[PDB]
């Protein structure tokens, strides 16, 4: 059970980190698109 749940939490951490990286690319893109214009 220890090894099983360790693999599970490793997969969860990997998914969360991939989510963070994709959201980071997205935030960089949108922030660059936003700061290029001032209302």
């Amino acid at each position: 059970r220890n090894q099983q749940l360790r693999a599970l939490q490793e997969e969860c951490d990997r998914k969360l980190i991939t989510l963070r990286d994709e959201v980071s690319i997205d935030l960089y893109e949108l922030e660059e698109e936003y700061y290029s214009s001032s209302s």
């Binding site: 220890n2 599970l8 939490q9 969860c12 951490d13 969360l16």
Partner: protein, 105 residues
Amino acid sequence: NERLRALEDIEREIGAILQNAGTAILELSKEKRLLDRQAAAFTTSVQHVEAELSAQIRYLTQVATGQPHEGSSYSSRKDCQMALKRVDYARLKISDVARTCEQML
């Protein structure tokens, strides 16, 4: 893991076979016959339990004064709870961002 569950299933099957052999011996020697001879083997099956008793007698017996397997090791379980909580928090933040985006349209 595997070996413990296997030995447990083996002991359970041994007990079941002993009960079945006892019931069969009772049904055979109750009323009507050479097959009753196999009924004697039922008693031998009882001896098998004694061997299991011996198997339990000369078993591990790590301390025989306390309980082994120190630690529930549920630190991993707590870490998994935190991971699921982070996933739920991310889902909530994503839902908020999606509501904001839908309102932007």
